[PDB]
């Protein structure tokens, strides 16, 4: 019964795990888009 309560809590825990993984993925996406912007800026500087 405590394990069933753990399952009920773990549904929210995995939801929090997914939210934190989504936050990490968005951080990775922010880093990647900023890297793409830096690549565009370096490409413009290389064109100059």
């Amino acid at each position: 019964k405590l394990l069933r309560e753990l399952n009920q809590t773990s549904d929210l825990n995995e939801r929090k795990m997914l939210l934190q993984a989504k936050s990490l993925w968005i951080d990775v996406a922010h880093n990647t888009d900023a890297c793409k912007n830096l690549e565009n800026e370096i490409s413009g500087i290389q064109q100059k």
Binding site: L3, L6, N7, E14
Partner: protein
């Protein structure tokens, strides 16, 4: 651990020495009466003769 527990929940959680033999004798009894369990127990637990 949560996914492992989910598979663990799938697994059953929390004597039958002669239950099957006694049950099968009870089902095929051809008798309309009391058929006390003591008779089935003594019949299905001979193990010697």
């Amino acid at each position: 651990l949560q996914d492992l527990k989910k598979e663990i929940l799938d697994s059953p959680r929390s004597i039958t020495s002669n239950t099957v033999a006694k049950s099968e004798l009870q089902k095929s009894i051809k008798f309309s009466g009391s058929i006390p369990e003591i008779y089935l127990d003594v019949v299905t637990k001979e193990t010697i003769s």
